[PDB]
Amino acid sequence: AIVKMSMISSKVIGLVNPAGITQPRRLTKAQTGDFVTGRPEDISFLQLEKQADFTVAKAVSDAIEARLSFA
Amino acid sequence: RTGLAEDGAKSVYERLKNDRAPYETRAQNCAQYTIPSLFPKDSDNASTDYQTPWQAVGARGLNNLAS
């Protein structure tokens, strides 16, 4: 489960709000610098917010690993 | 033979097995919560999987005490 969560997090997707004015075409067709019209809040990236579950899974896996290790 | 033996070994063993039942049940429970394979049930035989305990401390303590 943890490895699959990491693999899911690896994928990067640029979520652009249609209600905004930033258009990804001019972002893509631009070199370093190259002032482009837009707003930073328009562009956002989806993230795996499953964090607390990660903590509990890590805790339980660590406990199991410890008991097995000394066994 | 007579004197505690007239009936025979089999009959007395069968009679006394009924008084051994509570100890067997308690031993089976203790084995189940510790390493279950140590004290299998009479019905239990090959092809039976011993679900390992969740706590995994009774087995550790049993091994430590025995050693």
From Swiss-Prot, chain A:
Subcellular location: Virion
Parts of the chain that traverse the membrane: none
Coiled-coil segments: none
Disulfide bonds: none
Physiological role: Forms the portal vertex of the capsid. This portal plays critical roles in head assembly, genome packaging, neck/tail attachment, and genome ejection. The portal protein multimerizes as a single ring-shaped homododecamer arranged around a central channel.
Assembly and interaction partners: Homododecamer. Interacts with major capsid protein. Interacts with the tail tube protein gp11. Interacts with the terminase large subunit. Interacts with the internal virion protein gp14.
Similarity-based family: Belongs to the podoviridae portal protein family.
Protein name: Portal protein
